[PDB]
Structures are given as C-alpha cells and as structure tokens.
Amino acid sequence: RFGKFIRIHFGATGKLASADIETYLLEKSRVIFQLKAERDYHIFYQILSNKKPELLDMLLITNNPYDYAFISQGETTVASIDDAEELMATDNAFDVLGFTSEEKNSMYKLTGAIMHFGNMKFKLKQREEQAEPDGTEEADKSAYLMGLNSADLLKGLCHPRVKVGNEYVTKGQNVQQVIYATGALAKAVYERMFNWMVTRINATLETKQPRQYFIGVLDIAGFEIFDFNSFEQLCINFTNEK
Amino acid sequence: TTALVCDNGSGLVKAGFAGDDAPRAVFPSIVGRPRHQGVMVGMGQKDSYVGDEAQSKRGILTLKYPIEHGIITNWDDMEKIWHHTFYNELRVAPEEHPTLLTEAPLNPKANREKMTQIMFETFNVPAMYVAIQAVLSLYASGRTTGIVLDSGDGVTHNVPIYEGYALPHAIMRLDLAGRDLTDYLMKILTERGYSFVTTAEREIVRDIKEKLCYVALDFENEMATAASSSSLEKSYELPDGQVITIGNERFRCPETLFQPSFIGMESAGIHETTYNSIMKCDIDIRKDLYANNVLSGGTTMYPGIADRMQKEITALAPSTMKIKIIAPPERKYSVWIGGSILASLSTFQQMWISKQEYDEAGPSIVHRKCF
Amino acid sequence: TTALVCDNGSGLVKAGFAGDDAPRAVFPSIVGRPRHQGVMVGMGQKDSYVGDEAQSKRGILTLKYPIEHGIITNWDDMEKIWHHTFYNELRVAPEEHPTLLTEAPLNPKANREKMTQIMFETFNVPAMYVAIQAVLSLYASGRTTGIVLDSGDGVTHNVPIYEGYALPHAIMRLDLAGRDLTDYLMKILTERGYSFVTTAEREIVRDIKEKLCYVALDFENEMATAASSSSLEKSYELPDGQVITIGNERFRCPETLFQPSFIGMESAGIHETTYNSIMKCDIDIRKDLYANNVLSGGTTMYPGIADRMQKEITALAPSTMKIKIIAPPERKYSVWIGGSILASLSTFQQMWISKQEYDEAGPSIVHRKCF
Amino acid sequence: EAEKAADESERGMKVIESRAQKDEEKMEIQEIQLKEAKHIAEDADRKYEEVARKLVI
Ligand SMILES: Nc1ncnc2c1ncn2[C@@H]1O[C@H](COP(=O)(O)OP(=O)(O)O)[C@@H](O)[C@H]1O
Ligand SMILES: Nc1ncnc2c1ncn2[C@@H]1O[C@H](COP(=O)(O)OP(=O)(O)O)[C@@H](O)[C@H]1O
C-alpha cells in the first residue's frame, strides 16, 4: 500500500556512496475499516502466532482472533503466507540490526495496546447527553501497558481539555465523537510508529560517505480496479491519475 | 488564503481564524481614559487604554462600554476595539483575510450598514459577511432543529429553527442580560453594608457574580433555609482585603432572569418566553423543539440553571412530552465555534460580500439575499 | 413482461405490478413547497417535497393537492407525482412496462387526452389504457351484475352494471366526498373551541375523522342520547399534547353524506341517489340490482355505514324486494385489485393502445372506439 | 473536614446514581406496561362498541 521510495546517493567522483530511504502515502483507513473479503496488515495476524508463547502471556493477549473487534470484521485468515517463520525471520533481522531487544519488545507491546483500543465501550449518562464508560478492565490493562493512569485516560477521552484565550476549559463528547477519537488515536499512533521505524532503518543504513547527486527509485500501487470500489481505491486511483 | 472570524459580542470580544477549535484572543471590550492629571514628566501616558490593558490600570481609568445592548453607541471606541483586535491581538493584516461578523437579531439596519462600511473602508477587508448568533450556536451544537436560547451580556433572545428553516415571526428578544444582573447585584449588596459605585468596582461586582452566584431550584424553600441556616454564606477576597460574606444575596441575583419583576421589567421570565416562542411555531414541530432545547451564551453558565428551566418548562408544557435541555460545557464560546464551522464550509465561499459588490451597490447590499 | 397498475385517485396514489395480491406502494398525493427562507447554508434543500416525504415535513411546508375533484388542475405537480411513483416507490423504469390507469366517470375529455399525451411523451411507456374506477371494483368483488358505489376522496359516483353491460344513462355522479367531510369537521370543531386553519393541520383533522367518526343508525335518537348522557365522548391526542374531546361532533361529520344540506348542497343524499339510479334502469333487472349493492372507496369505511344505508334503501324500496349490501373489508384497495385482475387477463392483451397507434392516430385515439 | 465531606459526597453520589438507574429501569418498564394497558383498554372499548352496534341492529 505505502509508496516506498529509495534515494541512492553517489560520491563526488561518480562512485556509490550511500542510500537514503523514505516512505509516502501510507493508508490509515486499513487499520480500522476493512472490506468483508480482505484482511488487515500482516502485523496483527503475525503477532497472534502461537509459536511464541511468551509474548502472548506477557501482553495478556487473547489467543482467539475472533474476540478482538478490530480484526474480526474482515476475513480472519487466508493461506497467503505462513506467518510463523516470517515472524521469526523479521525478529532475527531486527536482532541482527543495530538496536537492542528492548525496542523490539516496546514495538510488540505498543502494537498490543493498539489492539486493545477496540474493546473500549461507552454508554449514555443519567440525565445528560454526555457519555461515560461502563467497563474499565480493558482500559486498566491498556493504561498499565502504556504506563499511564486509567482514570486520567478515561477523563481525557470523556472530557477533553481545550485552551481558549488564556484559560483552559473542558469540552463535552458524545458516544460517536469519542469512538471517532479512539479510532483516530489508533491510526495516528500506528503512523508515528511506522515513521519512527523508517527513520531508525534509514539511520542504521546510513554510511559516512558524502551525498552528491542521487538516483531515485519509486514504487507505487497500481490503478487497482474492483467491482466494489470505495474511498481507499478512490485515493489510489487519483494518485495514479496524477 | 484563510478566513477570519471575529465576534464583537457584548462585554467580551473574541476572535480567531476559521478552522480553529477555540478563539485565540478573548478580552473585555472596554475603552478607558485617564481621569486624573498626571505629574511625572517623561513617561508619556497614552490617551486611551483599550482591551485587556485597561483591566490592569482599572483603578485610574473610567471604563466605558462601546455597546449597550447589541447596538453600537460609541463608534470611535469600536474602531479602537477592532484595530486593537486586528493588530495587537492577532497581529495580522486584514487586507488579505475575509472577516465574518456576528450580530444579534432584531437590531437597527443602520448598525449593520455602518459595520460593513467601516470594515470595507477603514480596514479595506477584501470580503465580509454578517450572521445571526443563534444560527452559529445551533451549528456548534451539532443540531439541525431545536430552539436555542442565546443569553449574553447584552441581550437575551430565542430563535426557533426546524430542519434548517427559521421562524422569523416566533423570534422573541428580551433586553435583560448579564449587565442588568450585575446592576441588581450592586443594588442588593448595599442592604448588607457594601457600597460599589465607581465603574472600576463594576468589574469587582461582576467577578463576585461569576464566582459565587447560583440559581436555586426553588425560591421560597431556599429563602426559608437561608433565613435559619447559615450554610449558604461564603466569603470573598476583595483586591485589598476586608473579606465580605454574602448570604441569600448569592442566589437572589440570578433569580431576576426568572423573576424580571425584581428590576421593574414588565416582561416574563426566560422560562416563559421560551414556552411562548415554542407555542408561536406550528403545531407539527412543537415536539422536536421541546426535545432539542439548546442553551448558549455566558449568562446561561450559572450552576443549576438547566434544572430550574427544565422544571419550569415541564410545569408549563403538557405532561406527555419529554423536555430535554442541552447545556454543553462550552456555552460561552459556542457562537464562535459555530462561526468557525460556518466559515470553514466550502459552499460558503460564494456567499461573501465582495468588495466589487459593495462598491457597485453601496452599503445597502447587506440587506439583500446575502443577509 | 409485466404491467403496471397505477391508481391516481385523489389524496392517495396507489400502484404496483399486475398480478400482485395487493398494491405495493401507497402514499398520499401531495406536493409540498417550503414557505420559509432557510438560514442554515450548505444543506441544499430541494425546492419541492413530494409524496410521503411531505407528510414528515408538514410544519414547514404548504400542501397542495394536484387533484381537486377527479380532474387534474396542476399538471406539473401531477407529473412530479407520477415521476416519484415510477422512480422511487417502485424503482422500475417505465420504458418497457405497460400502464393501466383509472379515472372517475363523466370527466372532461381534455383531462384524459392530456394524461395520454403526457404518458406517451414524457415517460415513453410502450402502451397504456384507461378504465373506469367502478368497473374494476366490480371485477374485484367477483361479481358480474349489481351497482357499485365508489365514494373516494374526490368524487362519489354510481355505475349500474347488469351481466357486464353498462348503462350510461343511469350513471349518477356526486361531488361530495371525503375532502368535504374533512372541511366540514374543521368548520364544526370550532364550536368546541379548537381552531384548525393551516393546511398542515388539515391532515390532523383528517386523522381524527378517520379514527373517531362513525355513522349513526338513527340521527334524532343519537342526538338525544348525546345531549342527555356523555358516554359517546372520546378523547384524541394531538401531536403536541393538549388532548381534546369530541362528543356530538363524532357522528355529525359523516352524516353529511345522507344530509347534503349541511354543507349547502342541494343534491339528494347517498341513499336517495342510489335508489334513483336503481329506478333509472329497466324494470326486469331491478331485483338483481337491489340484491347486489357493492361498496368501495375509502369514504365507505365508516363503522355502521352499511347498516344505515341498508335501512334507508329498504325504507325507500318496496317491501317484497330483498336488499343486500356487500361491504368487503378491503374496500379502499378494491379498485386496484380489480385493475390488477383485469391487467392479468389474457384477452385484454389486445386492448392496449400501442405507441405506434398513438403516433398514427394522435392523442384523440383514446376517445375513439379503440378505447 | 473538607476531605471527609468529599468522601461523604462521593459515596452519596454513588448511591444516588445507583438508585437513579434503578428508577430509570422501573419507569421504563411501567411506561411500557402503560402502553400495553392502554392498547388493551382501547381494544376492548371498540370491540364492545362494534358488538353493541351489532346487537342493536
Ligand atoms: N461562570 C459564570 N457564571 C455566571 N455568569 C457568567 C459566567 N461566566 C460569564 N458570565 C457572564 O457572562 C457575560 C459574558 O457574556 P458573553 O458570552 O461575552 O456575551 P456576548 O457573547 O454577547 O459578548 C459576563 O458579563 C458575565 O457576567
Ligand atoms: N375508515 C375511515 N374513516 C374515515 N375516513 C376514511 C376512512 N378510510 C378512508 N377515509 C377517507 O377517504 C379518503 C381517501 O379515499 P380514497 O379511496 O383513497 O380516495 P382516492 O381513491 O380518490 O384516492 C381519505 O381522505 C380519508 O379521510
């Protein structure tokens, strides 16, 4: 989906110097909304591999993909690629890379936290249009993972503080707005994680050679056509037309 | 380019760019002049302090409000307010920013004409538009129907809107507002022993009103409780000392809204004007107006006003209707949020009064279909 | 292929494919226009609400029936009704579907000619046909003789048919119908203190008329009972509360059918017109005509109308003649059922008016023997 | 005593909101049975009206 782009730099005397990599146009709609016959990113399915038991129990991940709301809406699993040894290969590639295993563990735990954002529930109040949570166990475990406070996170979601002039005031949110905010936060944190990972890879790949004129290599998704075209396909078609 | 949303309001000027979630600059609309002589030579005091700066020098100035009830009465002070807002608060040149202005219903046409003339001539704004406070309040409330009660510091009015269609014959305007409440608080504080007369102490009385006053669900029961119990008394710290304790005077000032006979007004309370406005409309939309009662404005920020008004309307209305009152926490800034939403719409871009149209048709172009 | 059976009527458009047991789409035939200006921008209100949508927006629209008494007076509105029926309620393109139409007896020829012209030109239907609203009701009752009383909302008429041979010289038409009853109820509800003026609340009054009104077996006895006791009073809940109670007015509204002098018309009552049409025919078929009275149309759905009409006609008719009135539960939709039955017949396939025939013969083909 | 009053307020609001949601459920179920009771009452009313008209005829 994302528009991979690699810049290959050269030396002053026309000799290979270094490589610079960038990413563009990564789609966030795939994270939350999926077509009925299509899957999400391979990340979540790969994490649910049973060959690594330590991650599941240390993250308190439900082993059943059906229970999680964000994943079960799309097609649960296909025989595309056997996820197990692919996950182990990615883990080995990360291990032989420049950074330590604590960053990898932070990556997995952050992804697990993204997973538990769908379990949040909200209900109307006594005699007001405001919304309040009913269950808090998933909120408690997510806050524990992120190192936040569950009460503070719930208060922030229900009552967002905003700055007016020189004074802070609190805003009200109903169920629809808080669900939209929950989805937007999950998309944004995933985007930031991907961008930070790309920056880390670029830094590790970086050599100390000077960067004179470069040769760019661009990869982009094609002009996909379906019989059930939607917004995600519309953006891709518009980009291809440009 | 980007659009600019300015809300003159009454007693508070709030402005900011369109597409923002909150106004950047909020400050009182006060112009003050020094009333003493001044003996030090070299400092060179300016002859007019405008905006929030006049609050700092409150003790040596005569604070004058340029507008009484919506209508601008001192135009030069209003050019000063607008110049301050455009230059010392937003630090932008209005030469390349369309300006959206907010204006109360049922006001003299000369007011709008002069406003547009000043905007087009003095500041040379490329385009501008004037809108009604209630429509913006309904925009920011996430609603398309329902009757909205906008009660600021200048004037209180109700405008019923159903399915995006207004009911001009059912618009009711009442001049009772926050300023009259402050004046009544002054008149009722002197019976305890505290006298406030100077315009500087107007701000102190207003601050006491904001910080301590509240609306009682029942009047007679609360008065009976306060006649014997002393649990309703709270102390306030003046800017120099001598703390003052007020008893039943804290919940008697906002009762003027529901009992306008206290300050001699002939009209009825807001709870009754809302019901009368609802019954003015057609019979087929009264249920939706009952179920979508919207509140806005600073004066509607008193604790417990929503419950009191719901009880009063439920008493007035038939027993077979569900009366629901919407009181978002951001009542005060609802109008500006609605203005930002309105100016950020793409289909609104052809409804501006451009400079060419104003030049061709004169100031009278405001009262055309570009209302 | 399939045939469409559209029944415009007056105040209720009902349609569906031929061969169906019941009509598929039933909705009032009204066109609404917004009488206010609209303050919210970007919504993009349509300039005309048509069909069942206008019933939900009664409070901000003015409702005009395109059909006054059988005839069409506003052709643009009728075209809008037809377009809505073909493209939204049924969602079928009329390019490849024949249509069967109905109208009342004794109507202007210009109406029929213009209907045919519009239906071949605007919609380009392959073929169409016009049938009398009473003969179809006779088909739907499984009969072949007897008279049929089609009391709709626009017009009331009687068509005597014996052994499939119609008698044109004995057809009686009366302009009193449901609309006049609703107007009379509106007029007589004022004496109780309730005022209904707006066209929107005419629908409310129609709801009361449908729900509570009933025909009394005896007029003087029921009048005395209502004047003495109060057991006949019932209460109706308005859309905005304030439940109202109607007493003597409950059965005075439908009595206008048997007492046309209440609304000032000189013509005789329903029973008298039926008897006059019975005796207008020959003498050898009067017994069969007496024994096969058929009722249809919405207006004939009042509780107890059958008994009162039978009593009246028995009083008029000779004692040695058996009198029976057929009142099936599906009176309102009987005409459409008969139309579907007629369109499903195999022998009727050659009676359609082909488009080529219309082009060759002009709009006057319908009045020609190729009916 | 400020903290003591705050704790008093907290469990007071907890208990009153529990009773309030109980009351909401109660009022909802009695409103429903009000609908069925009214429906049955009007059903019996017009059924007897029809049968009385049949009896008189
Ligand atoms: N928390 C509060 N309680 C009571 N009154 C308040 C409160 N906040 C503001 N007000 C009153 O509201 C007024 C401000 O109204 P404002 O929204 O500025 O009106 P406008 O929009 O017409 O300028 C002030 O004069 C003040 O007296
Ligand atoms: N049960 C009823 N009681 C009273 N009025 C009725 C009843 N049923 C139908 N009507 C009246 O009949 C009218 C509709 O008659 P309808 O047969 O649809 O006329 P058309 O066929 O010309 O559309 C409505 O205006 C309605 O008020």
Ligand SMILES: [Mg+2]
């Ligand atoms: Mg205001």
Ligand SMILES: [Mg+2]
């Ligand atoms: Mg009819």
